[PDB]
Nucleic acid binder design. Sequence first.
DNA 1: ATGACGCATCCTTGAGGTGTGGAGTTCCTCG
DNA 2: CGAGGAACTCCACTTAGGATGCGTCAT
Lengths: 113, 192, 96
Amino acid sequence: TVGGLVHRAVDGDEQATHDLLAHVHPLALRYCRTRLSRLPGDARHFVEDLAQEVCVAVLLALPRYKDTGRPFEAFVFAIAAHKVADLQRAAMRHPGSTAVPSDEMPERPDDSL
Amino acid sequence: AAPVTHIWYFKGVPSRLGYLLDLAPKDLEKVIYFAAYMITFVDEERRTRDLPSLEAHVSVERQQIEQRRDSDLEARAKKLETDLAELEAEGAKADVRRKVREGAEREMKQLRDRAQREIDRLDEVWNRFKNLKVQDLEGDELLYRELRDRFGTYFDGSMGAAALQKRLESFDLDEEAERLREIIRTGKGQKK
Amino acid sequence: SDLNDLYRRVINRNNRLKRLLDLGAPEIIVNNEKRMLQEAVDALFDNGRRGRPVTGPGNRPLKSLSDMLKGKQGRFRQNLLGKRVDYSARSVIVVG
DNA sequence: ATGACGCATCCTTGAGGTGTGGAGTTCCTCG
DNA sequence: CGAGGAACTCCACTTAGGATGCGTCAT
């Protein structure tokens, strides 16, 4: 099952981690699809960029993944929510960055007389 | 770091779809948008040179496979006669013999089906190896693994935008220009 | 400007993939990131040509480098043939 | 306190929107 | 290579901004 797969992935096997991340991939995309699709900010299609990034986090957690029998799904949800919060503090803090095209070219005066 | 393809030329208007290599847009969007591998390189001259040795090794290893399956077959036979003898000695019910024979026959047909399957994928290895040609697509991946392990250190095949770069690093123009001109005046209709 | 955002995101994906491959991660995630980089550049050069165009704050699509040129409101038929000029008044007409 | 760091909480799933019209064409699947 | 024929690509184109994960590193 997945438990043994992650066990031999942390053992050091390349194919084990390969299959583990392959299985994590689509579930990460789908969870971020359901979570980030409604968040304030232009992130509806950035859910991919933090989905497989959770796998990057998995990569920085696997070598010291002292598993206690807990499923990896709660883990994945945890890092997904945490990276969602990271986006929240990156955007909503001084959220002056607005991609407005309709009120930028006519509304900007020119210093050169 | 990851190579990328321009969108106007490849995948863009059909009129200027590339066609440096005679491929369909469908083929391009499988190879570049990550569906299937391609064969970027082939060494057919060394393959033909070693064909004595390649076929000798194929014969040796197919004989090894066949004798392994014969060992499995005699293992099946001893299992079948053992269970026959013990269930005939038991005689608990009138349907233990027929049910054990049904199970044994299911096992037998499964064994021979997978033997047929492995010789069949070896036949696919055969035809793909003799038709080892560039600008060809391989939908499956485990078959590609088997092909590259068995025919190791002979050719190159993969994904990647730069994988097409290497193709354009090797493909000439004048020879096939003459060939398509020949088919332009020696040909029929839309081939021209 | 939207092109600013497109360049920002493609640079983000480039950095993420380069740092991932700096260590040699398993190939599935690497390939997914490579194809996402390809798709990001595809959207950059022409957001609407392939797939669902990438939007921004609202549901409206962003504008790529091949949309600020073509069309009526691009450069050719909007800014080079006719250039609004000084010493150019206007007012109401009355017969005399 | 922010925008940064360093992780990292046992049950698991979108969201709507998408109402012309014109001929060009070129591949692509079926005679 | 010779069929239908349905995608793909061109052209006509007019206001204020839904957060966290919690803890804390550092200024």
